[PDB]
Scaffold this active site. Structure first.
Site, PDB file in Angstrom:
ATOM      1  N   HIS A 133     -24.421  94.256  50.353  1.00  0.00           N
ATOM      2  CA  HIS A 133     -25.373  94.825  49.408  1.00  0.00           C
ATOM      3  C   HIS A 133     -25.440  96.345  49.598  1.00  0.00           C
ATOM      4  O   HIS A 133     -25.121  96.872  50.663  1.00  0.00           O
ATOM      5  CB  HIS A 133     -26.780  94.239  49.606  1.00  0.00           C
ATOM      6  CG  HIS A 133     -26.905  92.788  49.248  1.00  0.00           C
ATOM      7  ND1 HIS A 133     -27.115  92.354  47.956  1.00  0.00           N
ATOM      8  CD2 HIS A 133     -26.894  91.676  50.020  1.00  0.00           C
ATOM      9  CE1 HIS A 133     -27.209  91.035  47.945  1.00  0.00           C
ATOM     10  NE2 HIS A 133     -27.079  90.598  49.185  1.00  0.00           N
ATOM     11  N   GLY A 134     -25.884  97.053  48.555  1.00  0.00           N
ATOM     12  CA  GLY A 134     -26.030  98.499  48.688  1.00  0.00           C
ATOM     13  C   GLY A 134     -26.862  99.121  47.587  1.00  0.00           C
ATOM     14  O   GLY A 134     -27.242  98.462  46.612  1.00  0.00           O
TER      15      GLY A 134
ATOM     16  N   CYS B 159     -23.291  97.634  45.588  1.00  0.00           N
ATOM     17  CA  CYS B 159     -23.957  98.310  44.479  1.00  0.00           C
ATOM     18  C   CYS B 159     -24.281  99.764  44.832  1.00  0.00           C
ATOM     19  O   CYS B 159     -24.418 100.136  46.003  1.00  0.00           O
ATOM     20  CB  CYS B 159     -25.231  97.568  44.077  1.00  0.00           C
ATOM     21  SG  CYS B 159     -24.898  95.995  43.194  1.00  0.00           S
TER      22      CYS B 159
ATOM     23  N   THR C 272     -29.912  88.264  49.087  1.00  0.00           N
ATOM     24  CA  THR C 272     -29.190  87.013  48.877  1.00  0.00           C
ATOM     25  C   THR C 272     -27.897  86.948  49.689  1.00  0.00           C
ATOM     26  O   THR C 272     -27.324  87.969  50.088  1.00  0.00           O
ATOM     27  CB  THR C 272     -28.824  86.831  47.401  1.00  0.00           C
ATOM     28  OG1 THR C 272     -27.992  87.925  46.983  1.00  0.00           O
ATOM     29  CG2 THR C 272     -30.067  86.772  46.531  1.00  0.00           C
ATOM     30  N   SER C 273     -27.420  85.717  49.887  1.00  0.00           N
ATOM     31  CA  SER C 273     -26.101  85.492  50.469  1.00  0.00           C
ATOM     32  C   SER C 273     -25.006  85.865  49.477  1.00  0.00           C
ATOM     33  O   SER C 273     -25.086  85.534  48.290  1.00  0.00           O
ATOM     34  CB  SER C 273     -25.951  84.027  50.876  1.00  0.00           C
ATOM     35  OG  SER C 273     -26.686  83.775  52.060  1.00  0.00           O
TER      36      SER C 273
HETATM   37 NA    NA Z   1     -19.355 100.678  45.514  1.00  0.00          NA
END
Ligand code: NA
Ligand code: NA
Ligand code: NA
Lengths: 94, 143, 4
Positions: free
Chosen positions: B93-94, B135, B34-35
């Protein structure tokens, strides 16, 4: 004397290992919001680990998720300071 | 001179150092990511905050995994001799140990290894700060 | 509020 190749790194993670991290679409992320506020208020006064500790406290105390989805509602966050530093770090000098 | 203490990093080099901000907002459709609405607020806040600390700030937007690795490699090969420290901020993101380029993931170890004491000699003994908004998995803290 |  040699230095360990992993020495003198600091990782300021927004969240604990294994966890999601929260971002508000209007205000920005909980962690970055709090980090910038604490650097603005304390960078001319406090050592960096103590600034990041105030960030931990602010994220943990002042934020809680709001969601129409019960799985994602009313959740909390704690950031995670990971230090391989060998000295104290102050952003000012003299 | 008098007694000297060495408990604090030397932060009075001519320059505080670089602050590299990687702001990934829009991801390639095929990744399914997602954006990241709101991340521009973060990037602007960080730029101003580190400006007032006298860091030389460079903002980069929407980098692929290949572009992230080349940027970090190139920065690690600059001469940091006149700089007190180094700062890198990653907004993406992660997952545990991983951050996303716009087209796929990058191991965090690959990014930070460029700045090892034996691989970036003009930062040896100087503080290297990585600030990571991403994340680290899918657990939720109920409080 | 969204997750990363
Ligand atoms: Na982090
Ligand atoms: Na956050
Ligand atoms: Na070092």
């Amino acid at each position: 004397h040699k230095i360990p190749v992993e020495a003198d790194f600091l990782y300021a993670y927004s969240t604990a290992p294994g966890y999601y991290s929260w971002r508000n679409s209007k205000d920005g992320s909980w962690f970055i919001q709090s980090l910038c506020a604490m650097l603005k208020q304390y960078a001319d006064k406090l050592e960096f680990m103590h600034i990041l500790t105030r960030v931990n406290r602010k994220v943990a105390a002042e934020f809680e998720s709001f969601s129409f989805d019960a799985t994602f509602h009313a959740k909390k966050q704690i950031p995670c300071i990971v230090s391989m530093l060998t000295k104290e770090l102050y952003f000012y000098h003299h | 001179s008098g007694i000297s203490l060495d408990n604090s990093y030397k932060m009075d080099y001519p320059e505080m150092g670089l602050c590299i901000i990687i702001n990934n907002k829009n991801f390639h459709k095929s990744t399914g990511m997602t954006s990241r609405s709101g991340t521009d607020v973060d990037a602007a806040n960080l730029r101003e905050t580190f400006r007032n600390l006298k860091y030389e700030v460079r903002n980069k937007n929407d980098l692929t995994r290949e572009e992230i690795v080349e940027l970090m490699r190139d920065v690690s090969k600059e001469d940091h001799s006149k700089r007190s420290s180094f700062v890198c901020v990653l907004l993406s993101h992660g997952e545990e140990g991983i951050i996303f380029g716009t087209n796929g993931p990058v191991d965090l170890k690959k990014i930070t290894n460029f700045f090892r004491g034996d691989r970036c000699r003009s930062l040896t003994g100087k503080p290297k700060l990585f600030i990571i908004q991403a994340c680290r998995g899918t657990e939720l803290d109920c409080g | 509020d969204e997750v990363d």
